[PDB]
Amino acid sequence: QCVNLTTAYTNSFTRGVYYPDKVFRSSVLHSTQDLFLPFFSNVTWFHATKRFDNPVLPFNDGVYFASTEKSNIIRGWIFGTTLDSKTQSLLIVNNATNVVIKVCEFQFCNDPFLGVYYHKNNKSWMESEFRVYSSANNCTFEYVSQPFLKNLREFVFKNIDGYFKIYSKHTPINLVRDLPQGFSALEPLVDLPIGINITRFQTLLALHRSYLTPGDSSAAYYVGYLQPRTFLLKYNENGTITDAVDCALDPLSETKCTLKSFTVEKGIYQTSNFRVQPTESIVRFPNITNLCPFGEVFNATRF
Amino acid sequence: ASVYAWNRKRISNCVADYSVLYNSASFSTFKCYGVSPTKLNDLCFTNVYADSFVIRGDEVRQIAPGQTGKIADYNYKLPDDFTGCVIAWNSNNLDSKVGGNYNYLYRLFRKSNLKPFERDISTEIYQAGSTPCNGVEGFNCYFPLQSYGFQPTNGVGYQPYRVVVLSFELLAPATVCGPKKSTNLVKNKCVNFNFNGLTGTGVLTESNKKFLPFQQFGRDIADTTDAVRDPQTLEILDITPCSFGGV
Amino acid sequence: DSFVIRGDEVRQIAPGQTGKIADYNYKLPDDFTGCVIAWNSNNLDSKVGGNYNYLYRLFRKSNLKPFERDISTEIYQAGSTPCNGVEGFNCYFPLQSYG
Amino acid sequence: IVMMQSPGTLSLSPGERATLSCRASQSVSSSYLAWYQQKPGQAPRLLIYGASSRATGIPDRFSGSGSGTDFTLTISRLEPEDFAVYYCQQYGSSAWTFGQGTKV
Amino acid sequence: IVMMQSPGTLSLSPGERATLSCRASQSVSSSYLAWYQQKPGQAPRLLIYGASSRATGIPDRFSGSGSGTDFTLTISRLEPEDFAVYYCQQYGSSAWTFGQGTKV
Amino acid sequence: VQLVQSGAEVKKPGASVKVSCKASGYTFTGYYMHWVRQAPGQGLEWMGWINPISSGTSYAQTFQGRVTMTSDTSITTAYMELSRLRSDDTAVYYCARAAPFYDFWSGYSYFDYWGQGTLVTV
Amino acid sequence: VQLVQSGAEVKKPGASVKVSCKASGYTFTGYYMHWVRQAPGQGLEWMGWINPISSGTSYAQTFQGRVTMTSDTSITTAYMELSRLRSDDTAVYYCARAAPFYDFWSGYSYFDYWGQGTLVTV
Ligand SMILES: *[C@@H]1O[C@H](CO[C@@H]2O[C@@H](C)[C@@H](O)[C@@H](O)[C@@H]2O)[C@@H](O[C@@H]2O[C@H](CO)[C@@H](O[C@@H]3O[C@H](CO)[C@@H](O)[C@H](O)[C@@H]3O)[C@H](O)[C@H]2NC(C)=O)[C@H](O)[C@H]1NC(C)=O
Ligand SMILES: *[C@@H]1O[C@H](CO)[C@@H](O)[C@H](O)[C@H]1NC(C)=O
Ligand SMILES: *[C@@H]1O[C@H](CO)[C@@H](O)[C@H](O)[C@H]1NC(C)=O
Ligand SMILES: *[C@@H]1O[C@H](CO)[C@@H](O)[C@H](O)[C@H]1NC(C)=O
Ligand SMILES: *[C@@H]1O[C@H](CO)[C@@H](O)[C@H](O)[C@H]1NC(C)=O
Ligand SMILES: *[C@@H]1O[C@H](CO)[C@@H](O)[C@H](O)[C@H]1NC(C)=O
Ligand SMILES: *[C@@H]1O[C@H](CO)[C@@H](O)[C@H](O)[C@H]1NC(C)=O
Ligand SMILES: *[C@@H]1O[C@H](CO)[C@@H](O)[C@H](O)[C@H]1NC(C)=O
């Protein structure tokens, strides 16, 4: 069954950076080109009388996802295209004991969710039923591993060369409204051999039973998008990325990348080139309409 | 599968003996690109894809890098930097019947060429002229697919061939290795080595580098391997060159 | 150097080629200097019922070196178990006829 | 379109030459004009296509020519087997049209 | 190895379906299991090989399936020419073994 | 190339007739199968065609709404079903082969092979 | 593919019989030639095979020491000679074709072609 539930920006700062590969480096500044969340970009802030808005978002070239909660409301995500039984979709769900990742032709609900209730005797929250999809078939992939969903959880989702790559970080915070400032790189979580087309995704939330009453009365996260950017990453003595420069952020960051350093000395540096780009395409061919007699060659009676 | 709708099989986390296939007498074509067929068992890959389909004899040459034609352009395209092996054999005794086997289709018309490993299985009417077809075939409006109609009496060029293309991916830990027997790990000596496909010469010592759980090897400022994770013990080893210098 | 092969294999008599003939029978070097001349001999080397006097090597432990001539008939081991000169499962007679 | 053949009936001795005409109410591409022969009790067979090209198996005694709205079929020497009904056929506007046929 | 077919005798009307079973004393690769048909006064002919694959010239009325120690031959519709003796055959240990055969 | 049609049929007005045409000697799906009618004492009339590869059809406005063409590639056979038969549908029906519309040299503009006529009386 | 065997033979106990099998329609040396026996009222029993390219053989333990298989590629003919014939060797003998052991798709695991049975009475 399905339930019909449908009835702001923050600063990304210097977060959303992940280890670009699986190579150990130390005490070195490494320049890499990959899909990263641009520094100081506009990250959309979602908040799912009753009001419910947990929309399907574009995947674009990859997604930066973050949440700040101690209630374990965010349980998973749906990644796909039409998000119905017509095409294959990737379903990632966390629960009490493990993470289940499946690829099937899922017939997803418009407002997919996991039910949770407060057990009056145990005095704790417990799982009830899934209301994510009405049916699933033609399953091609299944994977099960360890669980990972003032507590900031960050994820990066990429879909490159058949691999659905997930990076993650778990950091304690003292913020309520905005994401924290400072630098912390996300580590590879899993490389999934999924091999599917993804253009849209949706967040799976655990909804309290009390919200499912028939009356009109009785879950925040951040989404950014990755871009093809050049980053200068600083690896410390233990091979941890502790800082980074977005080479396209501003003229100083560009200088820092050019000089392969996080510091710049007094002076004037040649860092880039300027060029005006064309806005139109002008085609001027001879104004003739007669066609070339090629057919007369191909359909000749005799060769 | 039909070539217009070729079937891709993903192979991983296994031992790949390619000598069984290469030394077989049962294949008519076995052409490798980017790799020698006799060195395959010494290599490790991060993934192998086995793409299977049926085409007619004359079209077997189109299953290669740098080719053009109805198959190369509209059905199954291989990249110019393809690494892998194209294996084919005559299947006239399997895929042909009296009266013609019309279960094998190929794409005859398309708006543009396919990208490498693109799989187009649409059946939308192809517009050859300037006038919209509106889903109706007729003059200047063609049904994009056609059958081979394989018959047991056809000449070789028109007999069915079963083609399997093994693409070798080299990203990522290698998961598909040849059937090579491992040796004991030796440290504090000048040795040749091969760590999950990573070859070289040098001295292996215990590393004090803080490798993360996902990292398989490291590199110095020269961007060359200077440390590896042993694929069996998960021990981190530093690699230095064997003593050398001018004389 | 003279020999008989089947039509489709004529392309294998060249530099940079692979196949049963190029690898196990007659190998030409990548720096080969010379000419490869061939003609149809269907009216000489064929007979009704099949001409089985023309053999080629189908199996070998390794590829030939340029201008190497291997005329042994030792049983080829395809498996891990020694053949001990006896053909059978995973033990093949290395030659075959064109017929 | 209307494809009109003439004469409705043609009669002459074996060994002689016969000319069969087909006229169109509108111009017809030479590539779209064909001639058929139908013997008594038999299905039609193709003789000429593309105005002038002989079909496989057709004797060189048969030839065709023409353009625009005027096409002909020529039988240089008539044999006993040529005394049949001939049709002209046109393609256009995604349709196939036959003339009324003439009997030799 | 022992290849045992059942029932020893099978009897039913033409137009109906017959199931023939073959059991092995030990597991047999599906690739090594074949079925034969032998008509009175005639040599055996191959029907099914590789457990399920039809031999050339064999009607699609015949099919096979199975694995391990249990294989079957199915005749979806029996024709007068199907009322013959069927055998199952196994390969292994460099030897070829036939079942005792069953008569339809 | 051979085209073999079904035998003659006799039907009452209002009835439907299905005439088959089995093809051999060529790639069945490589050609369009056309149907042409010839009433007694009359000339040849094109009815329509079917493209076996997709079972796509086109009909003359004369027969459109009465005739349905189908095919089965597994037996390389084409069918023409003419419903609501009238007395003026008494005719010899032919199947004929022509190239598809994508033929460069306009082989679709004519019919190169014909089956034996099948007489249907109404 | 055709396999043609010699005619029927009648032998006394202790005698030897040689049954030929002439093959045609295929590359003779490309296949193994197997022999299979069928005693009256009994099923099929595999005897052994010969590989014409090398004249290599293998026999069932039942016949090993009594049966010798030979061949002559110049006339694409295989022979099976069974010595020390006993009364229980009365049977119909067949020659049958199977792929060589190097066949990738296990064509050696079965016999795809059979000759006409040759009756030998002892
Ligand atoms: C031999 O080929 C010529 C050239 O035609 C060209 O090549 C053919 C193989 C096909 O691919 C054609 O589509 C291509 O144009 C034929 O002459 C040309 O025929 C076409 C089609 O009949 C003519 O187009 C028409 O022109 C009239 C106006 O007169 C329009 O009303 C129609 O709608 C349509 O556009 C084209 O004008 C004509 N060109 C010339 C120079 O004659 C030629 O008929 C053909 N011969 C044979 C035996 O096939
Ligand atoms: C996006 O970020 C810029 C700062 O670079 C800010 O000025 C702008 O108002 C933000 N847009 C929205 C809708 O908040
Ligand atoms: C993914 O699916 C969408 C349809 O929702 C389609 O428009 C898009 O082109 C597809 N992308 C790829 C790579 O197939
Ligand atoms: C979590 O998912 C696993 C799937 O393997 C299931 O067995 C387990 O019972 C689930 N636990 C809860 C609390 O849903
Ligand atoms: C309730 O609490 C008890 C422990 O006192 C536990 O064993 C039981 O499983 C809990 N009930 C549920 C549904 O988890
Ligand atoms: C897989 O998809 C095909 C095509 O829709 C369908 O026919 C088949 O039944 C599906 N598989 C399963 C197990 O339902
Ligand atoms: C590097 O690792 C060492 C050893 O665990 C630790 O003492 C040191 O503080 C770490 N330095 C940094 C910057 O993490
Ligand atoms: C096999 O490799 C794993 C590492 O993935 C190791 O933990 C295990 O002990 C090894 N087992 C043997 C027998 O070597």
Torsions phi, psi for A204 (to 5 deg): -95, 120
For residue D103, give both structure tokens.
Answer: 């009997």
Element (H, E) at B127: strand B126-127
Collect all residues of chain B within an 8 Å Cβ-Cβ radius of residue A162: 47
Give E-chain residues touching G63 at CB under 8 angstroms: none
Q: How far apart are the first and last CA of chain B?
A: 64
User: What residues are paired with E90 via a beta bridge?
Assistant: E33, E97
DSSP 8-state class, residue B106: E
Name the CATH superfamily, with its identifier, for domain G2-120: Immunoglobulins (2.60.40.10)
CA distances to A81, A85, A109, A134, B245 from A106, in Å:
11, 5, 9, 8, 64
Helix locations, D1-102, DSSP H: none
Q: How far is the CA of A196 from the centre of ligand 4 (A)?
A: 26
Chains in touch with A (3+ beta-carbon pairs under 8 Å) read B, D, F
Compute the half-sphere exposure of residue B123: CA atoms within 13 Å on the CB side of its CA. Answer: 9
In 3-state terms, what secondary structure has residue B80?
Answer: coil
Cβ–Cβ pairs < 8 A, chains A and D: 3
Are B38 and C24 in contact by the 8 Å Cβ rule? The answer is no
d(CA G21, CA G39): 19
Sign of CA dihedral C91, C93, C94, C97: negative
Does ligand 1 lie within 6 Å of residue D31's CB atom?
Answer: yes
Burial of A191 (0-12, 13-18, 19+ CB in 10 A): middle
3-state secondary structure of G112: coil
B196–A contact, CB cutoff 8 A: no
Decide if A299 touches D, using CB distance below 8 A. Answer: yes
Domain assignments of chain A as residue spans, ordered by start:
9-274
Q: Rounded distance, CA G97 to CA B144, Å?
A: 44
Tokens (6 digits) for G14 = 């202790």
Give the CATH H-level superfamily of domain A9-274.
Spike glycoprotein, N-terminal domain (2.60.120.960)
Cβ distance of F100 and B142 shorter than 8 Å: yes
CB B152 within 8 A of CB B97: yes
Ligand 7: nearest atom to the Cα of A236: 13
Query: CB distance A19–B212 less than 8 Å?
Result: yes
CA of A42 to the centre of ligand 2 (A): 6
Instruction: Please answer yes or no on whether B210 and A22 come within 8 Å at the CB atom.
Output: no
Please report the atom of ligand 7 found closest to the CA of residue A242.
13
Could you tell me the sign of the dihedral formed by the alpha carbons of F5, F6, F10, F12, in that order? negative
Task: Identify residue A138 by its one-letter amino acid code.
Answer: N
Q: Nearest ligand to the C-alpha of residue A199? A: 3
Alpha carbon separation from C79 to A273, C88, C93, C96 (Å, rounded) = 64, 11, 14, 19
Residues of chain D contacting residue F113, judged by C-beta atoms under 8 Å apart: 46
Tell me how close the Cα of A302 comes to any Cα of chain D, in angstroms: 11
Nearest CA in chain G to E96: G46
Q: How many angstroms separate the Cα of A153 from the Cα of each of A168, A172, A189, F101?
A: 7, 9, 13, 61
Chain A CB contacts of B212 below 8 Å: 19, 24, 187, 239
Ligand 2 pocket mutation, candidates A37, A39, A42, A178, criterion most atoms within 8 A of CB: A42
Residue in B25, B30, B38 closest to C63 by CB? B38
What tokens were used for E78? 């029996």
Tally the C-alpha atoms within 13 A of residue G38's C-alpha that lie toward its C-beta.
Answer: 25
The ligand 3 atom nearest the CA atom of A198: 1
Resolution in angstrom units: 2.5
Alpha helix stretches (DSSP H) within C9-98: 20-24
Q: How many Å lie between the centroid of ligand 3 and the Cα of residue B76?
A: 19
How far, in Å, from the CA of A41 to the mean position of ligand 2?
8
Q: Do A301 and D53 touch (CB under 8 A)?
A: yes
The structural domains of chain G, with segments of one domain joined by +, span 2-120
Tell me which residue has its CA closest to atom 3 in ligand 6.
A138
Question: d(Cα A10, Cα A175) in Å, to the nearest integer?
Answer: 12
Which residues from F are below 8 Å from A298, CB to CB? Answer: 104-105
Count CB atoms within 10 A of the CB of residue A38: 18
Q: Which residue has the tokens 């104004």?
A: A287
**Do the Cβ atoms of B25 and C96 come within 8 Å?**
yes
In the block, residue with structure tokens 């329509």: F48
* Rounded distance from Cα A198 to ligand 3 centre (Å): 7
Pairing mode, if any, of strands B7-11 and B47-56?
Answer: antiparallel
Ligand nearest to the Cα of A86, by number: 6
CB atoms inside a 10 Å sphere around CB B176: 19
CB distance C11 to C17 below 8 Å = yes
Contact A90, A78 (CB under 8 A): yes
For residue B100, how many other CB atoms are within 10 A of its CB? Answer: 26
Q: Write the DSSP string, G68-100.
A: EEEEEGGGTEEEEEE-S--GGG-EEEEEEEE--
Q: Is the bond into D7 cis (omega within 30 degrees of 0)? A: yes
- Contact call for residues G62 and G44 (beta carbons, < 8 A): no
CA–CA distance, B135 with F49 (Å, rounded to integer) = 17
**CB proximity list for A143: less than 8 A, separation 6 or greater:** A100, A101, A102, A190, A192
Long-range contacts of D53-59 (CB under 8 A, 24+ apart): D53/A301, D55/F112, D56/F112
Residues paired with B156 in a beta bridge: none
Residue closest to A4 by CA, chosen among A123, A119, A112: A112
Residue for token digits 């192998």? B48
E64 vs E47: CA distance, rounded Å: 9
The amino acid occupying position B242 is: C
Min distance A283 CA to chain F CA atoms (Å): 31
**What would the DSSP string read from start to end of A127-171?**
EEEEEEEEE-----EEEEE-----EEEEEEEEEETTEEEEEEEEE
D63 in contact with chain A, both atoms CB, cutoff 8 A: no
- CB-based contact (8 Å) between A301 and chain D? yes
Task: Give Cα separations from G65 to A299, G68, G69 (angstroms).
Answer: 74, 8, 11
Distance separating alpha carbons of residues E85 and B232, to the nearest angstrom:
57
A127 lines ligand 4 (CB under 6 A): yes
**Helix residue ranges per DSSP H, D1-103:** none
Chain B positions touching C20 (Cβ under 8 A) are: 25
CB A221 within 8 A of CB A54: no
Check pocket membership of A122 for ligand 5, CB cut-off 6 A: yes
Distance A137 CA to ligand 6 centre (A): 7
Give the single-character DSSP code of E9.
B
Q: How many helices (H) and strands (E) does chain G have?
A: 0, 11
Measured by CA distance, the residue closest to atom 7 of ligand 5 is A122
Q: How many CB atoms lie within 10 A of CB G48?
A: 22
Mutate to test the pocket of ligand 3, among A56, A60, A61, A81 (most ligand atoms within 8 A of CB): A81
| Experimental technique for the deposited model | cryo-EM
Residue with tokens 């016949």: G63
Phi and psi for C5 in degrees, rounded to 5?
Answer: -130, 170
Query: In angstroms, rounded to a whole number, what is the distance separating the alpha carbons of residues A210 and B148?
Result: 63
CA dist A155 and B194 (Å) reads 35
Structure tokens at B131: 């006038």
CA–CA separation, B103 vs B160, rounded Å? 12
Q: What is the chain F residue with the closest CA to B106?
A: F53
**Considering only alpha carbons, which residue of chain C is nearest residue B24?**
C59
Identify the burial level of C57 via C-beta atoms within 10 angstroms of its C-beta, where 0-12 means exposed, 13-18 middle and 19 or more buried: buried
Domains of chain E: 3-103 (2.60.40.10)
Question: Do C and F share at least 3 CB pairs under 8 Å?
Answer: no
3-state secondary structure of C88: strand
- CB contact under 8 Å between G56 and C93, yes or no, is yes
Q: Between chains, do F56 and B137 touch, taking CB under 8 Å as contact?
A: yes
Give one DSSP letter per residue of B8-28, joined into a string. Answer: EEEE-SEE---HHHHT-SS-S
**Backbone dihedral angles phi then psi of residue B74, each to the nearest 5 degrees:** -115, -10
CB A53, CB A7: distance < 8 Å: yes
**Rounded Cα distance, F44 and F47, in Å:** 10
Residue ID of nearest Cα to ligand 2 atom 12: A9
Assess contact for B76 and B63: CB atoms under 8 A: yes
> What sign results for the dihedral spanned by CA atoms A225, A226, A232, A236?
positive
Q: Residues near D16 by Cβ (< 8 Å), separated by ≥ 6?
A: D77, D78
* Residue nearest ligand 3's atom 12 by CA: A197
Best residue among A75, A94, A98, A129 to mutate for probing ligand 4's pocket (most ligand atoms within 8 Å of CB) is A98
Residue burial F29-48, b: 16+ Cβ < 10 Å; e: rest: bbbbbbbbbbeeeebbbbbb
Q: Return the residue in F4, F110, F118 with the most chain D beta carbons within 10 A, the one to mutate for interface testing.
A: F110
Strand partners, E57: none
Q: In what order do the strands lie in the sheet with A28-36?
A: A28-36, A227-235, A241-246
Tokens read off for A163:
């691999």
Q: Using beta carbons and an 8 Å cutoff, which residues of B are at the interface with C?
A: 23, 25, 30-31, 37-38
Please tell me what DSSP assigns to residue C22. H
Task: Give chain A's count of helices (H) and strands (E).
Answer: 2, 19
What 3-state DSSP class applies to D31?
A: helix
d(CA F104, CA F100): 10
Give dist(CA B132, CA B125) in Å, integer. Answer: 10
Q: Identity (one letter) of the amino acid at A139?
A: C
Q: Are strands B176-177 and B14-15 parallel, antiparallel or unpaired?
A: parallel
Please indicate if any CB of chain F lies within 8 Å of the CB of A299: yes
B37: closest chain C residue by CA: C18
Q: Which residues contact F5 (CB under 8 A, 6 or more apart)?
A: F19, F20, F21, F22, F93, F94, F95, F115, F116, F117, F118
Nearest CA in chain D to F59: D95
Through-space distance between the first and last CA atoms of chain F, rounded to whole angstroms = 31
Chain F: residue whose CA lies nearest to D8: F43
For a pocket test of ligand 6, which of A85, A138, A139, A141 has the largest count of ligand atoms closer than 8 A to its C-beta?
A: A138
**Which of B87, B96, B69 shows the shortest CA–CA distance to B155?**
B96
